[PDB]
Symmetry: C6
Subunit: 71 residues, 6 copies
């Protein structure tokens, strides 16, 4: 009866499967790309050549463009 | 006289009973779906086929569409 | 010279005395109801039949509709 | 060379001296009253008969209506 | 290879050198004054006679009006 | 299988390589400069002569103007 690590499993599955995601921000901006890397407080998006470091505290939702079978 | 774990009991009861919820965000967006999973900082909503990872820091309120008898 | 637990005493007194409250949110929404339950990060409002889980991080102020003699 | 407890000394001095304050919120609302009580995360304002529990995370600034000689 | 205490050194240098600063808030308000005191979560601004306690969580940026040679 | 320190490696690589960055804030403001220094909660931007202390809690995204080969 231990809590599964939902956030880490979601982010790592999207990362490993190179699934494109939409990342929505508190101010209404929507980013798109792949999750190249993440850690406790940030996510590194990559879209083609561009890198964007996203602070999780600024994210409202992440919507994957393919269904994740969360590992 | 110990504090009951309100948040976890609310989320887990909604999850186990597959109760549809409305999740309101700080920016006025309202999401709807079932709570498939949650952890300390996030909630995984599911509406039919779509998955949405929601950061709790972006939520104002959660309103269940059926009364929860909180376990 | 120890700090009194103001937040917990306020919330628990409103809860035990079933005092109606107004809960104001960061986005200008005002909720009304009784505090049925609370924990470290959330408050369960009840208004007649409706339940609402409120995240404290989204609250600006709580105004009780009767004066609380804080226990 | 230890850090002085600025927040606690400011709040406690305003409280003990019953100095009226203006409390500004992140959404532009300005509250006025005396600090009757405070703890780690909240401040209890009182204006005549009305009580208001204010969450510190919603405050931008506190401006005292008399100069505080911070104790 | 230890991390330098940037925030504390910046704030303490501005304080000790009595450098006027601009403090910008999340809601677009700009405050001006000297940093008289600070602690983990707050900054005490002073402009002539007026005191203002500023919560760091409400600050976006601090811009010093003279270049700081950070100690 | 340990988590790489993404945020620190991103910030330190931008700092050491003196790469110009765009820092976007929760309120829509965009800052530009080099990361001269950072710590757990703040980033010191420098643009020519001007210094700006940025609180990370106010940042949504950081976009480097050159691709970082994150060290």
């Amino acid at each position: 009866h231990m809590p599964y690590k939902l956030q880490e499993s979601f982010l790592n599955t999207a990362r490993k499967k190179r699934v494109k995601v939409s990342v929505y921000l508190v101010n209404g901006v929507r980013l798109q790309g792949r999750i190249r890397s993440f850690d406790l407080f940030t996510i590194l998006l990559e879209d083609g050549k561009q890198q964007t470091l996203v602070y999780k505290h600024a994210i409202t939702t992440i919507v994957p463009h393919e269904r994740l079978e969360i590992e």
